[PDB]
Structure formats: structure tokens, C-alpha cells
Amino acid sequence: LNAKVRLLREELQLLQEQGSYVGEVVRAMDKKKVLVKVHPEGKFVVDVDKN
Amino acid sequence: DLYSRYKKLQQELEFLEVQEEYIKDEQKNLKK
Amino acid sequence: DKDPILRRSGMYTVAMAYCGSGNNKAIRRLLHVAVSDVNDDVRRAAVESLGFILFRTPEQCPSVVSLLSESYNPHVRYGAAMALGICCAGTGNKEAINLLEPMTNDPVNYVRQGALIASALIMIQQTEITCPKVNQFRQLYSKVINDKHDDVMAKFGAILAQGILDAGGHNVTISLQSRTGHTHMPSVVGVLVFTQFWFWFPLSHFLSLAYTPTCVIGLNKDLKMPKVQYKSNCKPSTFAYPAPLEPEPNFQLLDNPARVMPAQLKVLTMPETCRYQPFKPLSIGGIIILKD
Amino acid sequence: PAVDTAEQVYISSLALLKMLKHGRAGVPMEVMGLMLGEFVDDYTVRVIDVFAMPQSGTGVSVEAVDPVFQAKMLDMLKQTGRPEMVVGWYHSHPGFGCWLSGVDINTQQSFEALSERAVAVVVDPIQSVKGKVVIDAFRLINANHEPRQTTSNLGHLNKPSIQALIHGLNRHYYSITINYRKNELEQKMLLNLHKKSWMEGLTLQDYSEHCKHNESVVKEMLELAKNYNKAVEEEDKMTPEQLAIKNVGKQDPKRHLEEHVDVLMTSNIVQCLAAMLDTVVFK
Ligand SMILES: [Zn+2]
Structure with a gap:
């Protein structure tokens, strides 16, 4: 119960963090970069997180 | 020795009862 | 009463009344207030008072304050920190240090402050051999004090912790009970009025009362210092000053007056070659009158 | 200063x-x-x-x-x-x-x-x-x-x-x-703002409406029990991660049964106790 309450108390400031775009991967390339189509915008050559 | 063990067990039992009551109250108030 | 400050005074009077009595009624009332009240200051005082109530059985305070320390209310977490500190002052409790270590990096600055001060209170005078985390906590205090992007209250707690860990030089310990088993009123009052520094910093100068020298002093028939040398059947490294910051002997000698720790009391002995003898056993400690 | x-x-x-x-x-x-x-x-x-x-x-x-x-x-x-x-x-x-x-x-x-x-x-x-x-x-x-x-x-x-x-x-x-x-x-x-009148406490509740509500909730609980039987057969053929997203956009018979049980118990216990209390108080 205490964990539930604590999570619901920090969730207010956890919910103001910016979302993340959802894109479609075209093909991996280069050192560690990727080519992604972020609809409705154009494509990007983005990095990849270490994980 | 045996008297000390017996009285220590009695004190432990009383402490366990106190803790049980406190935890039940804490759960009831955590719901609120 | 309806005033939160009056309820807080109620918690404090419970503590002072049932100081060192292990009273189940008082513990029940304190825990009820801690888990029920509407005012966080009252909750904090209620959790804190448990240390005064249970300071004679340090092994039990963790058993009641662990869950409160791991709580959703930072005020109750700070109360648990200070309760452990008061309960296990001058004791180096492994369980207390283990409970306090996770809280030293809590999200809340004043929770960190309370954790640091409680850790210092518990580990006063303790060496590497006696407690295996004193050096770690010393480095933690230095790191917090040196970091330039840390909370000011966390820095306050770290500085106070440095001060408390090395008190009176290194020749003083905090113990709410005398060596004979009586409640030390000056120390109880000092620790209470020091805990009341959340509201007034100048009151921090009350742990001076709680400070109690750790010394075995000899005396002559005329109450004057004799130049005796006591023996401690312990290794030189253990029970020794940490260090001046920039074949192990199995026996050491200490000169009257001697800086002898409460744990060292059990081992201190007098060499029979010397003409002076200790009237009451040296294990008791304190001012001892030496017969000849 | x-x-x-x-x-x-x-x-x-x-x-x-x-x-x-x-x-x-x-x-x-x-x-x-x-x-x-x-x-x-x-x-x-x-x-x-x-x-x-x-x-x-x-x-x-x-x-x-x-x-x-x-x-x-x-x-x-x-x-x-x-x-x-x-x-x-x-x-x-x-x-x-x-x-x-x-x-x-x-x-x-x-x-x-x-x-x-x-x-x-x-x-x-x-x-x-x-x-x-x-x-x-x-x-x-x-x-x-x-x-x-x-x-x-x-x-x-x-x-x-x-x-x-x-x-x-x-x-x-x-x-x-x-x-x-x-x-x-x-x-x-x-x-005192939220305190209600004393008579409201002892006032009973139309028995026709009470019985109708009980009947409706029991009829709902019947279908919920059917669905609960169906759901219990699952939870063994379910990935440890898939269980969480299993209840997304779909009814939860266990949760609804618990809620209905709580409401029914509260209503019926309150009504029976009020009836007995009135039976004694009013002659
Ligand atoms: Zn404006």
C-alpha cells in the first residue's frame, strides 16, 4: 500500500515529462545510427541508446 | 537463565502485539 | 488539543515522561499518532520520541522504525532517521547504519540531512575495526560538503555530521544513560533541544550537554592525579584515533588520564607491578580512586 | 534587516x-x-x-x-x-x-x-x-x-x-x-458543514426499489460469474507480460464481482439494521 501511495504521489511530476515520437525504421546503417520515418515529418538519421 | 528466557519471550510477545496493532492502524490510514 | 504545536508538545512530554522505560502504552500512543495525525510536524515528533522511549534496548528501535523510514511521508522518514540516531547514540548499531545508508541519498534534502546527522550520532568515536562503515560515511560527508550542486540543507547536515563524529577532540561520547544505568538528564535534555533545531539553529548548541567524556581518571588519597599507566589488552590499531588527514602488538599502555572508550572498558586492566590499585574494578570506568 | x-x-x-x-x-x-x-x-x-x-x-x-x-x-x-x-x-x-x-x-x-x-x-x-x-x-x-x-x-x-x-x-x-x-x-x-439531519439517518428506503436493485445486481453477477469461469481457465496459457495487457479494453469479472459484492453487502446490512433499530425505537 505504501509503495502504491508513493508512486501516485510522484506520478504527478512524472507525467509532465515529454513523450516520445513513434517512428518506423527503414534500415540500420553506419557506426550505430538508424534511418527512421517520423510520420508526418520526414526521415531522420538518429542514434541508438546504449541499451 | 530459564527465568530470563521466559521473561524475554514475554516481552517479545508484548512487542509483537504492539507492532501488530500499529501495522493494522497504518494500513487503515494508508487506505485513506 | 487542536493546535498542532500543542499536540507536538504532547508527543514530547510522552517521550520525556516515559524516557527509557520501554512503556508499551507510550509506544502505542506514539505509533498511533505517527500513522494517523494530520500534521507532519506532529508525525515527525511522534516517530522521534520512540528513540527516547526505547534507548535502553537499541536492538528494538530498528524493528519499529524500519517501516516508518521506508514510507511515503518525508517527514516521517526524517523522524525515523532521528529516532534511530537518538536510540543508538554512541552504539554503532549495524542495523541502524544499514537502515540509514539507503536514506543518505533520499530524494528529499532534509531527509538526507537527518540521515547524515543520525549516522554521525550513532558512529561517534567508532573506528574502522569497530564499525566497518565509519570511513565510508566520512567520505560521504566530505563528498556532500564539497559538491557544488547539492542542497544547502544536505550540506548543513553533512557539516554537522562531521562536527559530531569528531567531538571534544575525539574524547567524548553521547550516552543517554550513565555507566551505572541511570538516565542522564543533561544528555536527554540536550538531545531533545538539539532535535529542536528544525525550528531554531542557535539551539544546536545543546548537544554540548549530551557530550560525556570517555575517560578513566585516577586519583590519590588527597584527590590528585597519580602518574599511573593503565593497560588495555587490545591491539593498538583498534580503539585508536582514526588518522591525521594529510607484527601488530597485542597490548597497549595508557597514561592517567586515559582516553578509554566504552567498549575498551571491558578490556582495560591495571598492571600489578605498579603500586597503585583500582578501588572499584576498572571496567566500570570514570573517576577511580587509586589505593596504594 | x-x-x-x-x-x-x-x-x-x-x-x-x-x-x-x-x-x-x-x-x-x-x-x-x-x-x-x-x-x-x-x-x-x-x-x-x-x-x-x-x-x-x-x-x-x-x-x-x-x-x-x-x-x-x-x-x-x-x-x-x-x-x-x-x-x-x-x-x-x-x-x-x-x-x-x-x-x-x-x-x-x-x-x-x-x-x-x-x-x-x-x-x-x-x-x-x-x-x-x-x-x-x-x-x-x-x-x-x-x-x-x-x-x-x-x-x-x-x-x-x-x-x-x-x-x-x-x-x-x-x-x-x-x-x-x-x-x-x-x-x-x-x-459540521457536511453533517446531515438526524431523521435522514433512520429513514428507510422503499422496499420495492431496494428489491429491484438487488435483483438487477444479482442478474448482472450471473453473467459476471460466467465470464469469471471463462477467465479462470486462462491465466495459465498467458505470458507473464501478456497478463497485464490482457485487461486492456476488456471487462474484469473478478473486479466487477468484488465491487458488486461490496455494494450489495453494504446496502442490505444497512437496511436490515435500520429496520431492526426502528422496530425497537418506535414502539
Ligand atoms: Zn499575474
């Missing part, structure tokens, strides 16, 4: 309710008013009442239209037992959080010039919810060092919000803790 961080602004229940009601009434605008109170000591600024003033403006600004009203109101309150004089001003920021803008800072500068310790209170109606009210108190920092002296931990317990920090907190103005000290009669009235 200090202005300490343990200073607090005591807002009465009446003042808080008036502020919130006026702010909510003026949802798109920054409706505003004056705060009456006393400067007790250097650690208290008691706010005992607030009164709105005739004002007009757009959604980008609001200004007062007559000072004669303010003077006359102060006099006519003193005549009835409120000799307190203005200690600050309050205005509402509807959804922008709590902070001061440039015009707000200019108004607070005028108030500071009049009285040194005057404060500004920003109440945001729409972001306020039942449990919590979003409200803060402010004062300015001169062109200098530290604005205040800390002789306690009381000041550093609020974790200033990112929006206020962006808009100028701790740089052009500093916050003051708000406290809600109450008197015995205020406490008693607030507690």
Missing part, C-alpha cells in the same frame, strides 16, 4: 474561499482584490479577509476602475469591526501555475513602497482540485547577497516548481510559506 525564511502568511478559511470563488468566477481573466490583515511580528503576516474591487480588463490584463470603492469599503468595514488595513493583493492565474509577471511585479513594487512587508498571493482556480488548492505568496528582491536569512529549516520545505523557476522565482521574487491556522468555531463549522 533580515526578513527570515521562517516567516509565514496565515490565510483564514474565509479569505481562501473568497479568493478561490472570485478566481473561478473570472476564469479567463486575472481577477484581483485586496487582502486585509495585521503584521504580527517579523515572522507572521496574518490575512484575515479579502474583498474584491470593481475592475475591468481583457484576457491579457486586468485593472481596477475606482479607488473610491476601496477607501469606502475599508471605512465601512472598520465601522462594523474590521479595523485591519491592506497587507497585500491577490489575483488569479487560471492554469499558468503560481508566479508573478512584469505587471504583477510593478503592482507589488507599488505595494512594497507603501508598506515594506506587503505580499502578493496567486491562486490558480482551475488547477486546484478537491484535496489541494494551488496557492502561493510572494515578495520581491531588490537589485542586490542572499534575499533572506535562514535560522531554521522551515523555508526549505517546498521544492519550488519548474514553472515558477522559469518565470522568475528566486531571481526576481521569493516565496513565503502559507499556513492555515484556524480557531475553534471555524474548525467546528467546517466539520
Whole structure:
């Protein structure tokens, strides 16, 4: 119960963090970069997180 | 020795009862 | 009463009344207030008072304050920190240090402050051999004090912790009970009025009362210092000053007056070659009158 | 020469309710008013009442239209037992959080010039919810060092919000803790507000309607039990991760059964006990 309450108390400031775009991967390339189509915008050559 | 063990067990039992009551109250108030 | 400050005074009077009595009624009332009240200051005082109530059985305070320390209310977490500190002052409790270590990096600055001060209170005078985390906590205090992007209250707690860990030089310990088993009123009052520094910093100068020298002093028939040398059947490294910051002997000698720790009391002995003898056993400690 | 961080602004229940009601009434605008109170000591600024003033403006600004009203109101309150004089001003920021803008800072500068310790209170109606009210108190920092002296931990317990920090907190103005000290009669009235009439407690409930509700809920529980039987057969042919997303967009028979059980038990127990109590009390 205490964990539930604590999570619901920090969730207010956890919910103001910016979302993340959802894109479609075209093909991996280069050192560690990727080519992604972020609809409705154009494509990007983005990095990849270490994980 | 045996008297000390017996009285220590009695004190432990009383402490366990106190803790049980406190935890039940804490759960009831955590719901609120 | 309806005033939160009056309820807080109620918690404090419970503590002072049932100081060192292990009273189940008082513990029940304190825990009820801690888990029920509407005012966080009252909750904090209620959790804190448990240390005064249970300071004679340090092994039990963790058993009641662990869950409160791991709580959703930072005020109750700070109360648990200070309760452990008061309960296990001058004791180096492994369980207390283990409970306090996770809280030293809590999200809340004043929770960190309370954790640091409680850790210092518990580990006063303790060496590497006696407690295996004193050096770690010393480095933690230095790191917090040196970091330039840390909370000011966390820095306050770290500085106070440095001060408390090395008190009176290194020749003083905090113990709410005398060596004979009586409640030390000056120390109880000092620790209470020091805990009341959340509201007034100048009151921090009350742990001076709680400070109690750790010394075995000899005396002559005329109450004057004799130049005796006591023996401690312990290794030189253990029970020794940490260090001046920039074949192990199995026996050491200490000169009257001697800086002898409460744990060292059990081992201190007098060499029979010397003409002076200790009237009451040296294990008791304190001012001892030496017969000849 | 200090202005300490343990200073607090005591807002009465009446003042808080008036502020919130006026702010909510003026949802798109920054409706505003004056705060009456006393400067007790250097650690208290008691706010005992607030009164709105005739004002007009757009959604980008609001200004007062007559000072004669303010003077006359102060006099006519003193005549009835409120000799307190203005200690600050309050205005509402509807959804922008709590902070001061440039015009707000200019108004607070005028108030500071009049009285040194005057404060500004920003109440945001729409972001306020039942449990919590979003409200803060402010004062300015001169062109200098530290604005205040800390002789306690009381000041550093609020974790200033990112929006206020962006808009100028701790740089052009500093916050003051708000406290809600109450008197015995205020406490008693607030507690008594929700108390219902005694007869309502003993009043029974139409037995036809009660039986109809029981019948409806039992009929629903029948289908819920069918679905519960179906669901229990699952939870073994389910990935440990798939179980969580299994109950997304689909009914949960166990949860609904528990809720219906709770409601039925409460209603029936209450009705039976009330019936017996009435049976004895009324002859
Ligand atoms: Zn504004």
C-alpha cells in the first residue's frame, strides 16, 4: 500500500515529462545510427541508446 | 537463565502485539 | 488539543515522561499518532520520541522504525532517521547504519540531512575495526560538503555530521544513560533541544550537554592525579584515533588520564607491578580512586 | 534587516474561499482584490479577509476602475469591526501555475513602497482540485547577497516548481510559506458543514426499489460469474507480460464481482439494521 501511495504521489511530476515520437525504421546503417520515418515529418538519421 | 528466557519471550510477545496493532492502524490510514 | 504545536508538545512530554522505560502504552500512543495525525510536524515528533522511549534496548528501535523510514511521508522518514540516531547514540548499531545508508541519498534534502546527522550520532568515536562503515560515511560527508550542486540543507547536515563524529577532540561520547544505568538528564535534555533545531539553529548548541567524556581518571588519597599507566589488552590499531588527514602488538599502555572508550572498558586492566590499585574494578570506568 | 525564511502568511478559511470563488468566477481573466490583515511580528503576516474591487480588463490584463470603492469599503468595514488595513493583493492565474509577471511585479513594487512587508498571493482556480488548492505568496528582491536569512529549516520545505523557476522565482521574487491556522468555531463549522439531519439517518428506503436493485445486481453477477469461469481457465496459457495487457479494453469479472459484492453487502446490512433499530425505537 505504501509503495502504491508513493508512486501516485510522484506520478504527478512524472507525467509532465515529454513523450516520445513513434517512428518506423527503414534500415540500420553506419557506426550505430538508424534511418527512421517520423510520420508526418520526414526521415531522420538518429542514434541508438546504449541499451 | 530459564527465568530470563521466559521473561524475554514475554516481552517479545508484548512487542509483537504492539507492532501488530500499529501495522493494522497504518494500513487503515494508508487506505485513506 | 487542536493546535498542532500543542499536540507536538504532547508527543514530547510522552517521550520525556516515559524516557527509557520501554512503556508499551507510550509506544502505542506514539505509533498511533505517527500513522494517523494530520500534521507532519506532529508525525515527525511522534516517530522521534520512540528513540527516547526505547534507548535502553537499541536492538528494538530498528524493528519499529524500519517501516516508518521506508514510507511515503518525508517527514516521517526524517523522524525515523532521528529516532534511530537518538536510540543508538554512541552504539554503532549495524542495523541502524544499514537502515540509514539507503536514506543518505533520499530524494528529499532534509531527509538526507537527518540521515547524515543520525549516522554521525550513532558512529561517534567508532573506528574502522569497530564499525566497518565509519570511513565510508566520512567520505560521504566530505563528498556532500564539497559538491557544488547539492542542497544547502544536505550540506548543513553533512557539516554537522562531521562536527559530531569528531567531538571534544575525539574524547567524548553521547550516552543517554550513565555507566551505572541511570538516565542522564543533561544528555536527554540536550538531545531533545538539539532535535529542536528544525525550528531554531542557535539551539544546536545543546548537544554540548549530551557530550560525556570517555575517560578513566585516577586519583590519590588527597584527590590528585597519580602518574599511573593503565593497560588495555587490545591491539593498538583498534580503539585508536582514526588518522591525521594529510607484527601488530597485542597490548597497549595508557597514561592517567586515559582516553578509554566504552567498549575498551571491558578490556582495560591495571598492571600489578605498579603500586597503585583500582578501588572499584576498572571496567566500570570514570573517576577511580587509586589505593596504594 | 533580515526578513527570515521562517516567516509565514496565515490565510483564514474565509479569505481562501473568497479568493478561490472570485478566481473561478473570472476564469479567463486575472481577477484581483485586496487582502486585509495585521503584521504580527517579523515572522507572521496574518490575512484575515479579502474583498474584491470593481475592475475591468481583457484576457491579457486586468485593472481596477475606482479607488473610491476601496477607501469606502475599508471605512465601512472598520465601522462594523474590521479595523485591519491592506497587507497585500491577490489575483488569479487560471492554469499558468503560481508566479508573478512584469505587471504583477510593478503592482507589488507599488505595494512594497507603501508598506515594506506587503505580499502578493496567486491562486490558480482551475488547477486546484478537491484535496489541494494551488496557492502561493510572494515578495520581491531588490537589485542586490542572499534575499533572506535562514535560522531554521522551515523555508526549505517546498521544492519550488519548474514553472515558477522559469518565470522568475528566486531571481526576481521569493516565496513565503502559507499556513492555515484556524480557531475553534471555524474548525467546528467546517466539520459540521457536511453533517446531515438526524431523521435522514433512520429513514428507510422503499422496499420495492431496494428489491429491484438487488435483483438487477444479482442478474448482472450471473453473467459476471460466467465470464469469471471463462477467465479462470486462462491465466495459465498467458505470458507473464501478456497478463497485464490482457485487461486492456476488456471487462474484469473478478473486479466487477468484488465491487458488486461490496455494494450489495453494504446496502442490505444497512437496511436490515435500520429496520431492526426502528422496530425497537418506535414502539
Ligand atoms: Zn499575474
